[PDB]
Structure formats: structure tokens, C-alpha cells
Design a protein around this ligand. Sequence first.
Ligand SMILES: [Zn+2]
Length: 48
Amino acid sequence: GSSGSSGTGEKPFACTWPGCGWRFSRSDELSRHRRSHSGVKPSGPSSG
Ligand SMILES: [Zn+2]
């Protein structure tokens, strides 16, 4: 719209995948995203 962002607006967690440019203010928010891409997962026979 018109009103921009001044109060909040900071995401240190930036995706590692190449070309991608998704950032998150929280870690979990970034980890859950990484899923979208194909990469070695910390899980194997089981995961929560
Ligand atoms: Zn990404």
C-alpha cells in the first residue's frame, strides 16, 4: 500500500540456497523454509 515499515524490519536469518533471497527474523522460520530446497537434513530414520 502506502504506509511502509519503520517499527519492525530485520531478518538476520538469510537462506543459504543459491539464487534464493528469503530472510526470516527467527531461526525456526528460516530452518522450516530451507526445506523447500534440497539439502542434507539433520534427520534420517526419524524426525519431529
Ligand atoms: Zn531459500
